[PDB]
Design a protein around this motif. Sequence first.
Motif, PDB file in Angstrom:
ATOM      1  N   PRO A  60      -2.602   1.704  10.230  1.00  0.00           N
ATOM      2  CA  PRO A  60      -1.121   2.406  10.495  1.00  0.00           C
ATOM      3  C   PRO A  60      -0.294   2.239   9.172  1.00  0.00           C
ATOM      4  O   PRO A  60       0.137   1.282   8.916  1.00  0.00           O
ATOM      5  CB  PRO A  60      -0.593   1.741  11.593  1.00  0.00           C
ATOM      6  CG  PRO A  60      -1.293   0.320  11.762  1.00  0.00           C
ATOM      7  CD  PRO A  60      -2.846   0.815  11.212  1.00  0.00           C
ATOM      8  N   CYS A  61       0.019   3.579   8.559  1.00  0.00           N
ATOM      9  CA  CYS A  61       0.549   3.313   7.615  1.00  0.00           C
ATOM     10  C   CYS A  61       2.311   3.549   7.497  1.00  0.00           C
ATOM     11  O   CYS A  61       2.784   4.626   7.766  1.00  0.00           O
ATOM     12  CB  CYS A  61       0.294   4.850   6.587  1.00  0.00           C
ATOM     13  SG  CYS A  61       0.832   4.563   4.844  1.00  0.00           S
ATOM     14  N   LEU A  62       2.851   2.218   7.385  1.00  0.00           N
ATOM     15  CA  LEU A  62       4.306   2.153   7.526  1.00  0.00           C
ATOM     16  C   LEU A  62       5.085   2.613   6.250  1.00  0.00           C
ATOM     17  O   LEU A  62       6.365   2.250   6.190  1.00  0.00           O
ATOM     18  CB  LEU A  62       4.783   0.853   7.883  1.00  0.00           C
ATOM     19  CG  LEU A  62       4.038  -0.043   8.976  1.00  0.00           C
ATOM     20  CD1 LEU A  62       4.097  -1.309   8.679  1.00  0.00           C
ATOM     21  CD2 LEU A  62       4.464   0.678  10.235  1.00  0.00           C
ATOM     22  N   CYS A  63       4.450   3.341   5.209  1.00  0.00           N
ATOM     23  CA  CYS A  63       5.123   3.735   4.034  1.00  0.00           C
ATOM     24  C   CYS A  63       6.398   4.553   4.295  1.00  0.00           C
ATOM     25  O   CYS A  63       7.329   4.512   3.413  1.00  0.00           O
ATOM     26  CB  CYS A  63       4.206   4.416   3.133  1.00  0.00           C
ATOM     27  SG  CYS A  63       4.704   5.085   1.598  1.00  0.00           S
ATOM     28  N   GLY A  64       6.540   5.330   5.279  1.00  0.00           N
ATOM     29  CA  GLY A  64       7.530   6.297   5.511  1.00  0.00           C
ATOM     30  C   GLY A  64       7.619   7.231   4.424  1.00  0.00           C
ATOM     31  O   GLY A  64       8.819   8.103   4.272  1.00  0.00           O
ATOM     32  N   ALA A  65       6.454   7.666   3.663  1.00  0.00           N
ATOM     33  CA  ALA A  65       6.449   8.730   2.846  1.00  0.00           C
ATOM     34  C   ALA A  65       5.818  10.007   3.626  1.00  0.00           C
ATOM     35  O   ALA A  65       4.807   9.668   4.201  1.00  0.00           O
ATOM     36  CB  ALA A  65       5.651   8.183   1.617  1.00  0.00           C
ATOM     37  N   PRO A  66       6.074  11.136   3.193  1.00  0.00           N
ATOM     38  CA  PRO A  66       5.622  12.338   4.023  1.00  0.00           C
ATOM     39  C   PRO A  66       4.243  12.696   3.760  1.00  0.00           C
ATOM     40  O   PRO A  66       3.541  12.475   4.670  1.00  0.00           O
ATOM     41  CB  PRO A  66       6.694  13.353   3.729  1.00  0.00           C
ATOM     42  CG  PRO A  66       7.013  13.057   2.435  1.00  0.00           C
ATOM     43  CD  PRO A  66       6.975  11.482   1.950  1.00  0.00           C
ATOM     44  N   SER A  67       3.880  12.932   2.661  1.00  0.00           N
ATOM     45  CA  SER A  67       2.471  13.488   2.234  1.00  0.00           C
ATOM     46  C   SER A  67       1.450  12.207   2.277  1.00  0.00           C
ATOM     47  O   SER A  67       0.930  11.974   0.983  1.00  0.00           O
ATOM     48  CB  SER A  67       2.517  14.158   0.974  1.00  0.00           C
ATOM     49  OG  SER A  67       3.181  13.505  -0.237  1.00  0.00           O
ATOM     50  N   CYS A  68       1.208  11.432   3.148  1.00  0.00           N
ATOM     51  CA  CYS A  68       0.321  10.508   3.292  1.00  0.00           C
ATOM     52  C   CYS A  68      -0.166  10.327   4.733  1.00  0.00           C
ATOM     53  O   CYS A  68       0.555  10.345   5.544  1.00  0.00           O
ATOM     54  CB  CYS A  68       0.934   9.053   2.872  1.00  0.00           C
ATOM     55  SG  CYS A  68       2.125   8.085   4.058  1.00  0.00           S
ATOM     56  N   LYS A  69      -1.417  10.099   4.783  1.00  0.00           N
ATOM     57  CA  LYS A  69      -2.164   9.755   6.123  1.00  0.00           C
ATOM     58  C   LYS A  69      -1.452   8.558   6.795  1.00  0.00           C
ATOM     59  O   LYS A  69      -1.300   7.595   6.206  1.00  0.00           O
ATOM     60  CB  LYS A  69      -3.616   9.445   5.683  1.00  0.00           C
ATOM     61  CG  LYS A  69      -4.627   9.906   6.926  1.00  0.00           C
ATOM     62  CD  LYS A  69      -4.743   8.597   7.751  1.00  0.00           C
ATOM     63  CE  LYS A  69      -6.056   8.928   8.772  1.00  0.00           C
ATOM     64  NZ  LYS A  69      -6.592   7.702   9.378  1.00  0.00           N
ATOM     65  N   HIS A  75       0.752  -1.265   0.172  1.00  0.00           N
ATOM     66  CA  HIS A  75      -0.101  -0.107   0.059  1.00  0.00           C
ATOM     67  C   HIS A  75       0.948   1.265  -0.124  1.00  0.00           C
ATOM     68  O   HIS A  75       2.045   1.187   0.712  1.00  0.00           O
ATOM     69  CB  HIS A  75      -0.998  -0.019   1.171  1.00  0.00           C
ATOM     70  CG  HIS A  75      -1.851   1.186   1.313  1.00  0.00           C
ATOM     71  ND1 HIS A  75      -3.089   1.265   0.799  1.00  0.00           N
ATOM     72  CD2 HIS A  75      -1.507   2.387   1.904  1.00  0.00           C
ATOM     73  CE1 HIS A  75      -3.470   2.657   1.017  1.00  0.00           C
ATOM     74  NE2 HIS A  75      -2.572   3.435   1.651  1.00  0.00           N
ATOM     75  N   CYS A  76       0.339   2.361  -0.554  1.00  0.00           N
ATOM     76  CA  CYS A  76       0.827   3.748  -0.412  1.00  0.00           C
ATOM     77  C   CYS A  76      -0.095   4.450  -0.955  1.00  0.00           C
ATOM     78  O   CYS A  76      -0.610   4.454  -2.165  1.00  0.00           O
ATOM     79  CB  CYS A  76       2.186   3.732  -1.274  1.00  0.00           C
ATOM     80  SG  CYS A  76       2.723   5.322  -1.312  1.00  0.00           S
ATOM     81  N   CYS A  77      -0.554   5.397   0.071  1.00  0.00           N
ATOM     82  CA  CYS A  77      -1.709   6.377  -0.593  1.00  0.00           C
ATOM     83  C   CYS A  77      -1.257   7.342  -1.519  1.00  0.00           C
ATOM     84  O   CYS A  77      -2.195   8.155  -2.163  1.00  0.00           O
ATOM     85  CB  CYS A  77      -2.003   7.128   0.802  1.00  0.00           C
ATOM     86  SG  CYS A  77      -3.055   6.046   1.789  1.00  0.00           S
ATOM     87  N   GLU A  78      -0.063   7.549  -1.894  1.00  0.00           N
ATOM     88  CA  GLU A  78       0.388   7.945  -2.982  1.00  0.00           C
ATOM     89  C   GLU A  78       0.609   6.727  -4.007  1.00  0.00           C
ATOM     90  O   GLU A  78       1.679   6.210  -4.001  1.00  0.00           O
ATOM     91  CB  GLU A  78       1.620   8.594  -2.747  1.00  0.00           C
ATOM     92  CG  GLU A  78       1.611   9.926  -1.832  1.00  0.00           C
ATOM     93  CD  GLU A  78       2.859  10.304  -1.137  1.00  0.00           C
ATOM     94  OE1 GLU A  78       3.513   9.209  -0.817  1.00  0.00           O
ATOM     95  OE2 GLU A  78       3.226  11.314  -0.907  1.00  0.00           O
TER      96      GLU A  78
END
Lengths: 95, 98, 8, 86, 82, 83, 93, 93, 107, 107
Positions: F71-80, F28-31
């Motif tokens: 809980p979004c472990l993506c470590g990307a900045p512009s994401c919930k 997953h990545c909300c971007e």
Amino acid sequence: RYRPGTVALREIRRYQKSTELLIRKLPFQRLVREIAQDFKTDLRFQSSAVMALQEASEAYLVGLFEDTNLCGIHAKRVTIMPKDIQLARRIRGER
Amino acid sequence: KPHRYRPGTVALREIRRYQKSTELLIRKLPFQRLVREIAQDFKTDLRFQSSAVMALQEASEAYLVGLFEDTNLCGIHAKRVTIMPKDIQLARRIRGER
Amino acid sequence: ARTMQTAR
Amino acid sequence: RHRKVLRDNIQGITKPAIRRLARRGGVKRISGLIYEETRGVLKVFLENVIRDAVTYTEHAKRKTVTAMDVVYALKRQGRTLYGFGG
Amino acid sequence: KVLRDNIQGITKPAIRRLARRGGVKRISGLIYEETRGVLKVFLENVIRDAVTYTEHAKRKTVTAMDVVYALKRQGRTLYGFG
Amino acid sequence: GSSYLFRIDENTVIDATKRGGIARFINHCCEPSCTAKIIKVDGRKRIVIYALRDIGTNEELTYDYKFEREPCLCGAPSCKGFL
Amino acid sequence: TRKESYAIYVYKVLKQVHPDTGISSKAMSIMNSFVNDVFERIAGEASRLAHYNKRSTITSREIQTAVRLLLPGELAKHAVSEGTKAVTCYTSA
Amino acid sequence: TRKESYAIYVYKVLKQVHPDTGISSKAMSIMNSFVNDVFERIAGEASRLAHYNKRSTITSREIQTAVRLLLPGELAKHAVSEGTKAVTKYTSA
Amino acid sequence: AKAKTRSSRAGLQFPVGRVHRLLRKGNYAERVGAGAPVYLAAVLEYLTAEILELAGNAARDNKKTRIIPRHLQLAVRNDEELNKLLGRVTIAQGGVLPNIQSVLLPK
Amino acid sequence: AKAKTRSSRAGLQFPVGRVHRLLRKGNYAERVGAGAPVYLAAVLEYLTAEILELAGNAARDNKKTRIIPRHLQLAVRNDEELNKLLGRVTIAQGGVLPNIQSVLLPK
DNA sequence: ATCGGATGTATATATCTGACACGTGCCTGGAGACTAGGGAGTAATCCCCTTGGCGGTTAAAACGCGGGGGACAGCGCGTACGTGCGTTTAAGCGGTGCTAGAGCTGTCTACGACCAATTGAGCGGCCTCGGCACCGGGATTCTCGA
DNA sequence: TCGAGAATCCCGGTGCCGAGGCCGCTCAATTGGTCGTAGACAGCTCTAGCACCGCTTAAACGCACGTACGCGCTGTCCCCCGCGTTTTAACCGCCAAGGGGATTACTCCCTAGTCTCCAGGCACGTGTCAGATATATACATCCGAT
Ligand SMILES: [Zn+2]
């Protein structure tokens, strides 16, 4: 010392008035054999079939530079640049 | 003051609408009455097959569209976003038409 | 909940 | 006998030569970045003509790329060439 | 009857719609007569060759093959009508 | 602790815990870079996963899962931060 | 009257790659007229090519030099491979 | 072996218009190529046009409707006048 | 594969009866090789297979079953080397490829 | 036994015999008519006149008495209808029509 | 606007060269005569579609009108392209040798045309239903003045 | 950085006809014969393409230098966009005449084919003269200074 840019117009008229070949022969005839290496190995070139390739590559580049210089002029300047050449090829269909 | 769209964001909508559809973009009656005018100069009393006006229309409208793609590149190359008739007459000159 | 989905 | 694979004869299309070629094309000022772009353009033109020049010879089962085969390669791409015959 | 000036039926939106489809964003007002001066040049050539195919066949009707053959001749091949 | 179910039409899901294809392994990545439309072939639905941007060589494939709604472990900045 | 076209033979290939789809008639007249172009473009070039070498037969060797000229790049290599594979099967059987 | 050309028949028409200006060697090979070229184009067009009508004859009518396609405008009127002169003066005389 | 209907023997779909006729009543050369129409029907079938495959792919990606000419333009022009073979041609009723040059987008 | 050449009988200078053979050996169609190869031979003879006329005229203004390729380039490209016809054609060794653009000239 | 200064460029003259205009032999392709024959022309119908016209709806064009942003000209700057000059380094030549390959003749052998006799694939014509057009509601989301 | 508003995305329902599936029904393909010949193959003379050489030098190359041209930033403005109201001409359906396309049936005459005749044209050797080069020069073009 002439004004910069007037030896050019003294050089434009000189080449446009004559018909000799402008690329040197031997640095071209070697380039043809380098490129003909890929498609077949150890070809011979009947030596009027390189003159048939200067006269069709020189007369292609010159017709491209006439179409490049019209684009540079159209961008309101007098200096061709590689962002002109790539336009002239894109409009003719070539690229 | 009402909801006015900025100048430009109806262009970039009409671009993405028209590029995404296929229909003919010149009304058929002011084109049929154009072909029959231009065909008069070569023969008098020419009937046209109904298909062969469509067949003319489908190639002319794909010429100009292919010209306006080639036109707009010249504008962008001249650092503009406006196509002017010094741009059409370069795309035709470079392609070897005039 | 945790079921993946498209368009809702 | 001898075995050479050629390397970098495209540097034979020389920086003064692309200048003279440009002069006949009527230009005054050539940016210095042209001279590695024309070489790019020419090397693409020469490929497509030689690949059709060869394909004609290789059909006729020869090892010499004669002058009529070059001309038919040009005649096929809508560059017709008129001093070499047929 | 014999008509004149039907080319103003190729109307100013129907030039800008074609322009839109070809992806152009701002159109100078001088274009709308230049394009009618290009489209008349194109249609002149294609119909002149097309009538010539018709005339040769001792026929009086410009069929769809003629327009396709006139377009194929000038290097603008048209798939779609045979 | 890994939700391998997908949705084709709201009264059937597709499970990928034990059986399945490699397509479960998409994170997953909300971007997003990929999305999954529902295209039918020959009269059943299939879950096919298109792309949104040019994806590089050995680049990671992304997705939105659309867990609607709560809980979004993506470590990307512009994401919930959550899902 | 009987006016032949490649309507069915295009359909029989549509059922071999995508066996669930169909095709609109306006986009069948295109394919009917796409093949009639590639035919007259390949048999054209393969008849300037049997005449430069003073042959008078269109063999199957002209049709593969003609395809290695017209078809560009990777359509050349594939249509040669599916060419020769379908003439070998003809002669053997 | 002999290799044909239009090398002599150009030289006649050279002296017919300009009785003093000879032609070069290279500039005869051009005028030999150019005659072979237009012969390909005019008879090419007269071939594809006696086929669209499902005929089997390159009649003298087809070449008039092959010149009227290739030759641009001004030359189209003259080369048919210069044409139909010849086919008149051939049949009668 | 079979023994009748000469296309069956090569295992093709495109006819070799029709092609071998059309290579002799088309006046391409004097004598048509008997291998020749087979190889020619093999190349034709391959292209009709390749262009119908990318057409059908872009028809399911727009949710429609059958194929209309708008799909055929998208199959050709989005391809790298089928667009080049069909460079000069124009597909009737067939839209444009969507693109917008970069400086036209806002910023 | 009074074998008059067809080239003479029509009034031409181009070989109506050698055209009627090349209209057949090339396989342009099945039945080359007898009225046909005359009409070719005229049209070819007309064009080769019109380029040699303008070539000769270019030889005088250059003060030379042998037509060279440079005069053939100058005969074509200066004309409006021939240069429309021999459009894509490159004439070997012919050079270029002298022209500068008006921007490049100084004040 | 002048004008002399330089200087390459265009106009004369010698002369030498080898490329071309031209006779000579020949030879193979063009002409001539005539034959059969099918392909085109010239009738005839026949009916399909093109043209013309009309009446009514209405989407689309035209016209006017704010106003904003993009074209344009301006102006300064620095940089890089040109000019020149001096120096190298392959191009050119022209001359040899050579040998691989093109061209050519002579061989014959598989093979494509050709025709007949047969027949089944494919095309036109006719139903017939589902795929998409068409519309409705609503969730979405994109933009843009808050 | 936001709600408001607008357009677009999308889902579902209803309907129509166009795609597809069948059905006789030809004629175009296949089959299997002969029949001449094209093309393959071997063999060969010879030429022309490659390779090497030395030499001469024109030409490329490299650097310094100075400039003028690209380019970026600013200001002005005008003209193109957006949108609203009005206007109208496209369009859609309908009706009707009939012209011209398309086909069938003759029929003859023009073209393939064939054979015999001969001279046009092709390669080849050859003299000569236009043209290239070689050399001085009268003058246009440019540039620095006036
Ligand atoms: Zn994230």
